[PDB]
Design an enzyme around this catalytic site. Structure first.
Site, mmCIF file in Angstrom:
data_model
loop_
_atom_site.group_PDB
_atom_site.id
_atom_site.type_symbol
_atom_site.label_atom_id
_atom_site.label_comp_id
_atom_site.label_asym_id
_atom_site.label_seq_id
_atom_site.Cartn_x
_atom_site.Cartn_y
_atom_site.Cartn_z
ATOM 1 N N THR A 149 0.772 -1.249 0.000
ATOM 2 C CA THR A 149 0.000 0.000 0.000
ATOM 3 C C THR A 149 0.817 1.322 0.000
ATOM 4 O OG1 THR A 149 -0.249 -0.625 2.289
ATOM 5 C CG2 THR A 149 -2.154 -0.876 0.883
ATOM 6 N N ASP B 160 -7.148 3.560 4.567
ATOM 7 C CA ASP B 160 -6.599 3.812 5.872
ATOM 8 C C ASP B 160 -5.290 4.531 5.795
ATOM 9 O OD1 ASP B 160 -8.690 3.141 7.555
ATOM 10 O OD2 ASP B 160 -7.882 1.105 7.943
ATOM 11 N N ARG C 160 -7.251 0.894 -3.418
ATOM 12 C CA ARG C 160 -8.227 0.638 -2.373
ATOM 13 C C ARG C 160 -9.241 1.762 -2.173
ATOM 14 N NH1 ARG C 160 -7.521 -1.642 3.906
ATOM 15 N NH2 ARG C 160 -6.012 0.017 4.263
ATOM 16 N N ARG D 225 10.617 -3.093 11.471
ATOM 17 C CA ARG D 225 11.999 -3.410 11.792
ATOM 18 C C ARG D 225 12.237 -4.892 12.058
ATOM 19 N NH1 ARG D 225 11.005 2.460 14.026
ATOM 20 N NH2 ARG D 225 9.318 2.004 12.539
ATOM 21 N N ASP E 100 -2.210 6.020 15.293
ATOM 22 C CA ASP E 100 -3.144 6.634 14.331
ATOM 23 C C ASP E 100 -4.574 6.292 14.793
ATOM 24 O OD1 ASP E 100 -3.427 4.206 11.811
ATOM 25 O OD2 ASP E 100 -1.752 4.155 13.231
HETATM 26 K K LIG Z 1 -10.731 0.905 8.254
HETATM 27 MG MG LIG Z 2 -8.533 -1.778 7.928
#
Ligand SMILES: [K+]
Ligand SMILES: [Mg+2]
Ligand SMILES: [Cl-]
Ligand SMILES: [Cl-]
Ligand SMILES: [Cl-]
Ligand SMILES: [Cl-]
Ligand SMILES: [Cl-]
Ligand SMILES: [Cl-]
Ligand SMILES: [Cl-]
Ligand SMILES: [Cl-]
Ligand SMILES: [Cl-]
Ligand SMILES: [Cl-]
Ligand SMILES: [K+]
Ligand SMILES: [K+]
Ligand SMILES: [K+]
Ligand SMILES: [K+]
Ligand SMILES: [K+]
Ligand SMILES: [K+]
Ligand SMILES: [K+]
Ligand SMILES: [K+]
Ligand SMILES: [K+]
Ligand SMILES: [K+]
Ligand SMILES: [K+]
Ligand SMILES: [Mg+2]
Ligand SMILES: [Mg+2]
Lengths: 349, 349, 349
Positions: free
Chosen positions: C15, C49, C81, C233, C305
């Site tokens: 993404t 997102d 998306r 990481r 977030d």
């Molecule tokens: K979502």
């Molecule tokens: Mg989601």
């Protein structure tokens, strides 16, 4: 998907015997006295497995006497457990009859009762029989439709699957299945039904059952709860399972004692302090594996509650099946158990 | 839910090749001689995977010759495995044709045959095709409806799911699916179908498949059994899995040798003595991880039975898919395998 | 069962934010420049997102600007998306509107777009709403029916179950669900939906979700992929999960950085060399368990977030539910958190 009930979460689901072989309502009257962290979010006077069957008609009267005199102060929700069984119309009818007695509004219990707990359900059409019984009880006693919450113990293969198309079954206008509230795993009988066996006889963990039940509760707007944890002394094990359940989205669990209620009420809450992680006490360190003979002494002398009996009835049953159908094995079986043990094991009902 | 078959439990499900490339019925004649703990509860002369395909028509004749001459004394139940496949009408028709030959009552086999084992089934409507074939075979040969038990190998995603609404599919009056007896996991092909891969190429454990199959057997009144355990020498591993299965309520398992039959016959039985628990041998301690090149030497030189081939066909397939569709990666792929290995791997059918 | 799409396998599903709070198409333009092992098999400009919601209308324009100028050279498949949600007609309508803008053929993007990725879907009838939107978008813009592949993120209980009868829903002539391509686990929101919680707040592993999704992809001819692995990481952990997934037949996984794309592109390929098996680095060795107070400082100061927020909203929510309904516990709760923390926790939206 959304939950239809006052309690969005339920951490503790605490059972008590309804009539013991004194004042047979003893267990109930004290459990009704519990306050604070010693009180369950949900309290289950148990007219089913907790209670000897011949005490069961008396249990239902005690449920009415105790909730009558004391229900009003009880700080959690109250949901007594009825008898029931997917395979047994007499049991179904019994459960409904107790349910009908309990809720007569002229007796003072109904108004402190939030709902009932239906053990041993089968496929969704068995759930619809129970729901129909709730609808009728409600109508006979001028209660509002849907006001008695039904909760089910998931303790057969059939009922694990039945959770699969619940969202859409529930919306048919011919049942009142919105009344569903809790989906409660019952590892003990589930183990019997699945014919599983462990070398110690401790319950297998059934993570998939627990996943499936968290999934079903989430997709259908119910609350998932896990089943009794019998080793009451094993505080660490109980917290380890509750933590495991919490990672499944199963957030409540059965409690068997007020100490379990306290562990259970506390565990899903965030800890007080932060913590940093890095990459006759002997009894809680010992498990016995019984022998064929052990198991047959034990069963023999049982004639351990019901569930210990049925649990061991499995390897014995597999033994009997084998004995009945394998003459060719009859000799080596004896050469390995002694001819005495064998035809003794053959005798176990 | 209740089981419809003479055998309430089945510990051992033992396969034998039906015709080997001598007397091609060799394996069958000896396996038919097994008695006591060396005999399986269920014996499967295997006309499918155990047997080279060009030997298969001869296998079906050998099934009739051996069960004819020797079936009568065989102490367990006999259930030969037919060919079949959810994706292949020719295979379906072949299986039914062998089934029809085998059961001609004028040949002496049918009366020692308890049922057949249908590999590779798909969704429930593929199960109904097999069941229809059993119904027809029964009618052509004056056998009673339902007398041939059908058992299925669960070895696709589709068939794992098909176990979900079996209780209700089975009761429709248009099939005879009550004939179902065993639900047998087939980890080998299931692994292919699910496109799974392990670094050693040993079967993944698929606990959920095994749960799902125990659940399905319990909800539908069938008996669950687990699939072949290939590492015949690894007696400890075989007992460890059988114990794991037993905790799922999967109580029988596939056996590949008479020693596996003995382990398998013994494991689900309770131990002789009690026990107390507390909180070139080198080969059974070593597993090899093959390299791309290893796998391509190996495949190349195969042109290891079918199933070793198909298993490795997965990473190779993923490689070919990648090679076909990612020119930009062509250079780094070569800089990592050598240009020789790559267009060699590209050549694997 | 067979796959309907050009890509038989997909290792990487990568993404990128579509508009950042400069040139807001920054992330897109560079990600579009990736070649070789740094390029995903599937590239997902993410208007959901990854992107702040008030940047979302701009994201859709950037998707069109960047794929317009640069799509033609991008070596993998491109599948942006959209927004969507089983519970939110406005979100559904928004997603379809962006989808409709993006594909206007006079704008140059559509011809480098292979399909779209629909997050948050519900039960199969929610999938049919999205599919209907694809059908309409296709018709409005003279594209061929079925040419936009739809992929779904599995991130509710409902959508996990919906995978169960997909083979037969998909063949009804009233949807175009053959367009389905990927079934992508979304552990982050799945965790919210299932109300699961872990002491560190790291995602539970949900092996059963991953099994169920591999099964569903195999039975329905789709490709299974696993969800984001946030600890970028932790290269070892990422390879350990990909290996675990590969043993489920889940062969692709979400990648969050070009380094994850490289690990992900490489892991399912067979190793270069053979291998033999035998029977501030400190940070990757430390996990913190937050306290009630930690979690309330943290949340309080969030107004990490969205998903860190919602994740912790669970124990806080369970706390609020408990506080709202258990007066009897009010005292012991305070005696354990301090009266200050409690009515502070009570304030969290
Ligand atoms: K979502
Ligand atoms: Mg989601
Ligand atoms: Cl009944
Ligand atoms: Cl276990
Ligand atoms: Cl399932
Ligand atoms: Cl829940
Ligand atoms: Cl076909
Ligand atoms: Cl594994
Ligand atoms: Cl079984
Ligand atoms: Cl909606
Ligand atoms: Cl976990
Ligand atoms: Cl897949
Ligand atoms: K019971
Ligand atoms: K209803
Ligand atoms: K109704
Ligand atoms: K849940
Ligand atoms: K096969
Ligand atoms: K039938
Ligand atoms: K019939
Ligand atoms: K079972
Ligand atoms: K269709
Ligand atoms: K259509
Ligand atoms: K798969
Ligand atoms: Mg029970
Ligand atoms: Mg096979």
């Amino acid at each position: 998907t959304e939950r239809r009930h006052d309690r969005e979460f339920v951490r503790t689901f605490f059972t008590s015997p309804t009539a013991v072989e004194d004042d047979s309502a003893k267990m109930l009257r004290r459990a009704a006295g519990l306050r604070g962290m010693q009180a369950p979010d949900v309290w289950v006077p148990d007219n089913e497995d907790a209670t000897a069957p011949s005490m069961r008609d008396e249990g239902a009267e005690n449920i009415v006497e105790v909730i009558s005199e004391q229900g009003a102060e009880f700080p959690g929700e109250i949901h007594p457990r009825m008898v029931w069984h997917r395979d047994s119309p007499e049991t179904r009818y019994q459960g409904f009859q107790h349910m009908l007695d309990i809720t007569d509004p002229e007796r003072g219990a109904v108004e402190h009762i939030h709902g009932f707990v239906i053990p041993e359900v089968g496929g969704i059409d068995d759930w619809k029989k129970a729901d129909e019984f709730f609808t009728i009880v409600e109508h006979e006693h001028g209660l509002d439709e849907g006001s008695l919450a039904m909760s089910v113990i998931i303790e057969s293969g059939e009922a694990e699957l039945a959770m699969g198309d619940l969202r859409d079954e529930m919306g048919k206008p011919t049942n009142n299945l919105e009344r569903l509230f809790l989906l409660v795993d019952g590892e003990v009988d589930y183990t019997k039904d699945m014919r599983a066996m462990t070398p110690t006889g401790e319950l297998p963990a059934w993570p998939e059952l627990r996943h499936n039940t968290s999934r079903g509760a989430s997709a259908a707007g119910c609350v998932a709860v896990d089943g009794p944890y019998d080793d009451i002394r094993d505080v660490e094990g109980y917290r380890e399972r509750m933590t495991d359940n919490q990672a499944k989205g199963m957030l409540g669990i059965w409690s068997l004692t007020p100490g379990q209620v306290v562990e259970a009420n506390t565990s899903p809450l965030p800890p007080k302090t932060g913590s940093w992680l890095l990459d006759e006490e002997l009894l809680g360190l010992t498990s016995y594996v019984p022998s064929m003979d052990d198991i047959v002494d034990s069963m023999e002398e049982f004639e351990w509650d019901e569930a210990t009996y049925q649990a061991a009835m499995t390897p014995i049953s597999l033994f009997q099946d084998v004995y009945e159908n394998r003459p060719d094995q009859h000799e080596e079986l004896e050469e390995r158990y002694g001819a005495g043990v064998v035809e003794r094991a053959m005798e176990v009902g």
